[PDB]
């Protein structure tokens with residue numbers, strides 16, 4: 001009887017296959033000939049973009065220990081090459097075929113295939129990814145489209161990449177959305193670049209719900225009156241958040257765009273522009289786009305008839321070339337037959353940690369939990385460890401499964417509360433999930449085991465990347481020691497972010513919000529840092545048209561558009577004129593912490609930072625019931 005069958009092999013299954021090989025557990029892989037979207041994109045030569053997530057969050061620990069020198073954003077080419085490299089290692093263990101049906105019994109499943117071969121396995125893992133409407137626009141994108149108008153009903157990373165590729169051919173873009181949360185992918189902290197996933201310090205949730213919420217929620221909720229922030233200059237960017245019924249912030253179910261702010265784009269790529277664009281580093285600054293009117297926001301019920309293909313905003317009847325519906329992603333699940341008769345219904349919320357379904361035996365889901373920020377790698381590595389331990393250690397299997405039904409109800413209570421299931425339930429803060437899985441496995445850190453102030457920085461401020469949990473214990477990876485050292489030395493041990501929590505502990509929601517924005521450049525959607533880069537933008541667009549061999553006439557003026565922009569940017573052209581502390585508070589906080597770094601916490605004497613730093617040994621909201 002085959003012990004483990006893995007269905008689908010692309011990116012998600014890679015670390016589970018590694019653990020099964022390591023323990024010499026018996027496994028076969030079934031994966032389709034056709035491959036993934038990355039195989040589509042490679043074939044048609046469209047691996048010409050970059051990830052919206054950092055190296056440290058996007059490649060697995062066993063690759064990072066060998067290949068990390070600095071923080072950067074990998075290209076689509078680099079991500080693919082890394083899938084392919086791992087595919088080559090395991091190809092001989094992969095049966096090329098398509099699973100059409102799984103019949104699940106008490107201690108085995110019967111797997112049926114397109115070819116007609118059947119397989120019996122005790123443990124089955126699905127790692128099949130998602131179908132995405134948007135993949136076709138992307139995989140079959142026509143660059144000859146010039147001077148046309150596009151309407152998008154949804155803003156996601158996929159829409160944002162399409163927009164990046166359209167604007168250089170002077171294609172005009174209308175968003176007819178109920179708003180969107182967007183973040184600068186890279187940010188300046190007193191002159192050093194941090195990826196947004198380095199500043200989330202998630203373990204501070206354990207000190208209190210209320211404190212973590214102040215740290216994180218101001219750039220997402222409309223909590224500041226500061227007229228520099230995109231969501232005051234362009235209020236139609238704001239979303240309905242009435243659905244949220246959870247004290248856990250940022251809530252599960254919140255999706256965001258990650259984009260290159262033009263300033264950071266400038267700092268990295270200005271000196272070799274054509275070369276960078278051709279590797280896949282594309283300017284996708286949605287906030288620059290609103291500021292320059294190259295995109296505009298129109299309310300979600302604006303007038304448009306799909307028959308004549310027109311949208312009507314002001315008194316211009318605007319001919320549009322295409323409507324883009326909205327990226328829906330549903331798991332590529334085969335038919336699963338409960339007891340071999342009753343079709344299993346997939347619902348993220350009715351699985352434990354996105355992995356363990358109810359009513360099925362020895363079936364696990366790998367790759368169907370989405371990170372709010374950072375790459376999938378953080379989520380799939382910890383899932384691979386979770387599933388590996390469940391499969392190879394019957395003790396662990398029993399413990400989790402014993403009260404699985406209550407675990408799921410406790411989890412849904414904590415993270416979703418009473419809110420109706422939503423299509424984005426599968427979206428979790430990465431540094432919550434990695435840590436949740438760490439505590440179920442038992443490869444977590446105990447805060448009470450922190451000795452020095454250094455140790456408190458590691459526990460609270462050092463990101464909860466999967467590799468953070470592979471330094472020691474059951475799933476230790478060699479090299480992580482060195483890796484953590486390099487990351488610490490390049491990021492001043494994450495003191496800056498640790499000092500953030502200190503600065504806002506005594507503040508309230510409103511105070512915290514305005515402090516977050518009292519910087520010269522606040523982290524996210526600072527509209528003071530756009531106008532300066534209008535000339536670089538024109539140089540960028542020129543450089544893009546050179547790499548993509550495009551000719552377009554800028555001497556040709558679409559008048560119709562300019563008038564539409566004026567109406568969109570009204571609140572902006574009124575609120576932006578009223579422009580003209582965090583910087584100083586971090587400055588002196590970092591100096592204080594970089595001095596008492598090796599100081600014993602218990603030793604610390606009875607300003608009030610001190611008392612709070614000592615209570616970090618006994619956080620009062622450590623309780624997670626679903627564990």
Ligand SMILES: Cc1cc2nc3c(=O)[nH]c(=O)nc-3n(C[C@H](O)[C@H](O)[C@H](O)COP(=O)(O)OP(=O)(O)OC[C@H]3O[C@@H](n4cnc5c(N)ncnc54)[C@H](O)[C@@H]3O)c2cc1C
Pocket residue numbers: 007008009010011012013030031032034035036037038050051052053057058097098099100127128129130132138332333334366367374375376377
């Ligand atoms: C355009 C795009 C950009 C992305 N950018 C990023 C990024 O910047 N950062 C990041 O972290 N993540 C990113 N992702 C998400 C993630 O990294 C990819 O979705 C990744 O391909 C998911 O890996 P997977 O292994 O779960 O699925 P896939 O890579 O799709 O692999 C699943 C495999 O299973 C096969 N298969 C499916 N059904 C069956 C079946 N019934 N039987 C047999 N074989 C089957 C498929 O053919 C495929 O070969 C991006 C995704 C897309 C689409």
Ligand SMILES: N[C@@H](Cc1c[nH]c2ccccc12)C(=O)O
Pocket residue numbers: 183196197199200215216217219373500516523
């Ligand atoms: N705590 C940091 C970073 C941060 C806030 N909200 C975020 C959301 C996503 C990623 C990072 C963040 C800040 O206040 O600026």
Ligand SMILES: N[C@@H](Cc1c[nH]c2ccccc12)C(=O)O
Pocket residue numbers: 052053132156157158327329370371374375376
């Ligand atoms: N393009 C897909 C998947 C995706 C893009 N970037 C990601 C980063 C992490 C995880 C998944 C993704 C979507 O947003 O629908």
